[PDB]
Design a protein around this ligand. Structure first.
Ligand SMILES: OC[C@H]1O[C@@H](O[C@H]2[C@H](O)[C@@H](O)[C@H](O)O[C@@H]2CO)[C@H](O)[C@@H](O)[C@H]1O
Ligand SMILES: OC[C@H]1O[C@@H](O[C@H]2[C@H](O)[C@@H](O)[C@H](O)O[C@@H]2CO)[C@H](O)[C@@H](O)[C@H]1O
Lengths: 134, 134
């Protein structure tokens, strides 16, 4: 089903590194950090072709029983279908710090000021091959 | 609920390191590698007090809709309630190689000759604090 790391707290000051492979013919895949599939503090969607979006990163938060908040977009897109990627995430109470495979970074606000997350998962057209959370 | 890493394949030649903390007043906790909570290729139970078992490791496999197979027991028990532990596991098609916090090792047969596992989880009276699967 989806690839997930559950109930191993991702706390302030820890680093999460995930590696994986994008499917050949991928439309989009996302990495999600939050509490559940309906409560996501940092959604990072990688869009190869989705609606009018082609080769863009879209970041947002999802509030339980409320929905998606304000999207932030980045044009940094070092991803190729069929190829590996590696992403590292850390955060403090104000900011998620994301580092992409090529060393470029994206920052996204920690909107709820959360200090720990109990669910990390990947969804969509990719698979994970390794994880370090420490 | 339980701490789990799901659908990030633990394959032949990868290493899994988990760290955690044993509950004060723990009865037992286990680390489990398999396919589901009813299909476990390597169950490693840490028994502080369970029936007549006190400070013993018990290893076994669980077959779906069939049950527990032949138990193997070890007397190596460098664990203290309320304290941290660290365990590393690797395997080939014949053997699971487990290394405990103090450097001692335990080996347990890979009874189904499996080459990849899609579920790693901890159950019982402990919690996980970090994981590396690579
Ligand atoms: O914001 C993340 C969220 O986006 C949804 O798609 C949006 C799309 O980004 C936007 O440009 C359009 O106007 O509305 C769509 C629907 O809200 C995705 O459907 C969702 O999965 C998230 O990725
Ligand atoms: O073998 C692992 C399995 O053990 C069960 O407990 C056993 C116990 O080890 C044995 O000495 C006794 O005779 O029978 C019990 C029931 O089969 C646990 O209940 C189970 O959770 C596993 O840990």
């Amino acid at each position: 089903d989806r690839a997930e790391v559950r109930n191993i707290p991702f706390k302030l000051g820890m680093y999460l590194t995930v590696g994986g492979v994008v499917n050949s013919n991928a439309t989009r895949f996302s990495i999600n950090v939050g509490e559940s599939t309906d409560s996501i503090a940092m959604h990072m969607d990688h869009r190869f072709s989705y609606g009018a979006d082609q080769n863009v990163l879209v970041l947002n938060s999802l509030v339980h029983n409320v929905g998606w908040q304000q999207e932030e977009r980045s044009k940094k897109f070092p991803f190729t279908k069929g190829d590996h990627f590696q992403t590292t995430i850390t955060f403090d109470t104000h900011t998620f710090y994301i580092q992409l495979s090529n060393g470029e970074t994206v920052e996204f606000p920690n909107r709820n000021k959360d200090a720990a997350f109990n669910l990390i998962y990947l969804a969509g057209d990719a698979r994970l091959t390794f994880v370090r959370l420490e």
